[PDB]
């Protein structure tokens, strides 16, 4: 099979900043495609026979190549460009992709904003406990939770999700989980978590009294 | 305009086969290719073949000869693909996508089917309010939200006001919890001095497990 090596395999850039992804093929291939695919989303074709556009592409995107080498070029990147790539040959048996390259786009530093969330009264009933600090819309992605339980810190019993960039602000948001059993809940009362961030230059605790 | 509306998510035991399709509208089947590629972790792609409906004929990626088949009902132009002999390597999400007789790439794909392979059954989700509060509040924005709790398989999908409220909501991407079942949340700002006024509802779709949950979420 044609093995398609895409590289690099990640990339950040500031909106107005030109940039090329390359994808490099084990032989050689003409006529290359290249599909967008947003997280959640189908792909959509993007640029088709080495450098056509697809109906609705925006006309910074541009492909180019020859024998093993093609390329995609944003000629000046926007915010809503954050999405994976992926080239893909038809030149033999059997078609293949790359493994993709995804852009994520700069922007400025923002901390979390902090929220925390007590369990309902509905989930304690059936014997479970689950509190829920949120962080909205920072950046960068890299951000530290802490729970503390009555200045307890807590560890292996919290879960944290990530969401993809958004397509407009360029910012991420962030849950973590903490969840207790229904008697070791209502053994304590203070439920605090601490967050830290590249852009925080100390602590945010946001916290709640059981009660 | 072009559509390709492919069937739901699926839950199958190791072993076992599923039966796939495409509806295919705003243009003539025949006149077109269909493929069928697979997505593993929300990352790989692989073309599994294709098929010219105009006279059954399908060519296939050998990887997955007689793990997949392809066919075609011309009368209702859909397109369908059996997977047999299902295993865990085989729970991915599956897409149709319209090809060419041109050299055009796939210039339109349908919307996926996510297939799990496990022993496990299926189980809708507890959806549980997360509440605003004045701990959830800030310079006159509350958060508010649902957490969607020990669903399985994957996916769910969560709207507000069943599709009206789209500004500031963010969905998190599901945890696989250590007991085997999924769980996310789904939260949404908004201006807390509507907190009083506005009703708030999360909508939550278990296709697997044929479920839909409302759930109203209101201050303390």
């Known amino acids: 099979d044609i093995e398609l090596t895409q590289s690099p395999a990640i990339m950040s850039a500031s909106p107005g900043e030109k940039v090329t992804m390359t994808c490099s093929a084990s032989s050689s291939v003409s006529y290359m495609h290249w599909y967008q695919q947003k997280s959640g989303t189908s792909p959509k074709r993007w640029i088709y026979?080495?450098?056509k556009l697809a109906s609705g592409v925006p006309g910074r995107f541009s492909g180019s190549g020859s024998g093993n080498s093609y390329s995609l070029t944003i000629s000046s990147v926007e915010a809503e460009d954050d999405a994976t790539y992926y080239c893909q040959q038809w030149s033999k048996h059997p078609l293949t992709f790359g493994s993709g390259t995804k852009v994520e786009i700069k922007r400025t530093v923002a901390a979390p904003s902090v929220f925390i969330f007590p369990p309902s009264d509905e989930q304690l009933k059936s014997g479970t406990a689950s509190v829920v600090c949120l962080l909205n819309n920072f950046y960068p992605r890299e951000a530290k939770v802490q729970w503390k339980v009555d200045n307890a810190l807590q560890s292996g019993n919290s879960q944290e999700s990530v969401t993809e960039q958004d397509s407009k602000d360029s910012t991420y948001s962030l849950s973590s989980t903490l969840t207790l059993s229904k008697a070791d809940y209502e053994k304590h009362k203070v439920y605090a978590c601490e967050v830290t961030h590249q852009g925080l230059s100390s602590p945010v605790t946001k916290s709640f009294n059981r009660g | 305009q072009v559509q390709l509306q492919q069937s739901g998510p699926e839950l199958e035991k190791p072993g076992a086969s599923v039966k796939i399709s495409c509806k295919a509208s705003?243009?003539?089947?025949?006149?077109?290719?269909m493929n069928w590629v697979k997505q593993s972790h929300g990352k790989s792609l692989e073309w599994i073949g294709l098929?010219?409906?105009?006279?059954?004929?399908?060519s296939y990626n050998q990887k997955f000869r007689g793990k997949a088949t392809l066919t075609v009902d011309k009368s209702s132009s859909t397109a369908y693909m059996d997977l047999l002999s299902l295993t865990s390597e085989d729970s991915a999400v599956y897409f149709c996508?319209?090809?060419?007789?041109?050299?055009?790439?796939?210039?339109?794909w349908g919307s996926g089917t996510p297939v799990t392979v496990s022993s496990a059954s299926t189980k809708g989700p507890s959806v549980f309010p997360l509440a605003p509060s004045s701990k959830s509040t800030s310079g006159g924005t509350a958060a508010l939200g649902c957490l969607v709790k020990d669903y399985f398989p994957e996916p769910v999908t969560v709207s507000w006001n069943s599709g009206a409220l789209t500004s500031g909501v963010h969905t998190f991407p599901a945890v696989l919890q250590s007991s085997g079942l999924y769980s996310l949340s789904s939260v949404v700002t908004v201006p807390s001095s509507s907190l009083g006024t506005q009703t708030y509802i999360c909508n939550v779709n278990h296709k697997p497990s044929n479920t839909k949950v409302d759930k109203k979420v209101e201050p303390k």
């Open positions: 996508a319209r090809g060419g007789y041109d050299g055009r790439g796939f210039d339109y």
């Open positions: 026979d080495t450098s």
């Open positions: 098929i010219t409906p105009y006279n059954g004929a399908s």
């Open positions: 705003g243009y003539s089947f025949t006149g077109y290719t």
